[PDB]
Structure 1
Amino acid sequence: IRGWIFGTTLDSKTQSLLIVNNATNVVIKVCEFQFCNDPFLGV
């Protein structure tokens, strides 16, 4: 487990919150995100 997504619709038309543990770091963003249809990180 390496992150979380939050929002209302999760389809860019209204804002969404992304939280990620980037190995050592932690990153937080609020954006008009369009996610991929099956979210995961390739490692």
Structure 2
Amino acid sequence: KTQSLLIVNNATNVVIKVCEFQFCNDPFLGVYYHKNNKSWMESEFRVYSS
């Protein structure tokens, strides 16, 4: 219904986005490490539906 602003920081850079996000009740980033390196951590964004 209203415009929203979104800041996320993954392992590489910043994502700053201003859009009409359909946020869910509990936004989060699912974190998993890779099986061999574990130096960085991969993120799955579950913040907004659309």
> What's the counterpart of residue 36 of structure 1?
24
CA distance in 2, matches of 1:19, 1:30: 9
Identity score, percent: 100
Say what the alpha-carbon RMSD is for the aligned residues.
Answer: 0.8
TM-score (norm 1): 0.63
> What's the counterpart of residue 21 of structure 1?
9
Find runs of 4+ consecutive structure 1 residues off by over 3 angstroms: none
Number of matched pairs: 31
Unaligned residue ranges in structure 1 (runs of 5+): 1-12
Q: Which structure has the larger Rg over C-alpha atoms? A: 2
